[PDB]
Amino acid sequence: GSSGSSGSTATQKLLRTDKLEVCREFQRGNCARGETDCRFAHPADSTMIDTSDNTVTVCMDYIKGRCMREKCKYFHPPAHLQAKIKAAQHQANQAAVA
Ligand SMILES: [Zn+2]
Ligand SMILES: [Zn+2]
């Protein structure tokens, strides 16, 4: 076979929704809005963080309201947030801009 047509651009082609951008301030302890008034998730453990993208996985089950996965090892976002994501899946209208 070809075994590699071409690698001009080094980047995959896909998109996920279970990815929360970890805050930069909180990490050091500067964020005042907190995971509550802050859109970015605040990892308390700060262990499942990738220094490559700086994003944490999102528990799909939990989002639905029932999280009983096997040894759930994903971040659990707050209520306000949990929704922000849900809406995305369920076709709906968007609010104005800030
Ligand atoms: Zn924050
Ligand atoms: Zn979970």
Swiss-Prot record:
Tissue distribution of the protein: Expressed in heart, brain, placenta, lung, liver, skeletal muscle, kidney and pancreas.
Location in the cell: Nucleus; Cytoplasm
C3H1-type zinc-finger residues: 17-45, 53-79
Quaternary structure annotation from Swiss-Prot or TrEMBL: Interacts with ITGA3.
Family affiliation: Belongs to the muscleblind family.
Cited function: Mediates pre-mRNA alternative splicing regulation. Acts either as activator or repressor of splicing on specific pre-mRNA targets. Inhibits cardiac troponin-T (TNNT2) pre-mRNA exon inclusion but induces insulin receptor (IR) pre-mRNA exon inclusion in muscle. Antagonizes the alternative splicing activity pattern of CELF proteins. RNA-binding protein that binds to 5'ACACCC-3' core sequence, termed zipcode, within the 3'UTR of ITGA3. Binds to CUG triplet repeat expansion in myotonic dystrophy muscle cells by sequestering the target RNAs.
Full protein name: Muscleblind-like protein 2
Gene source species: Homo sapiens (Human)
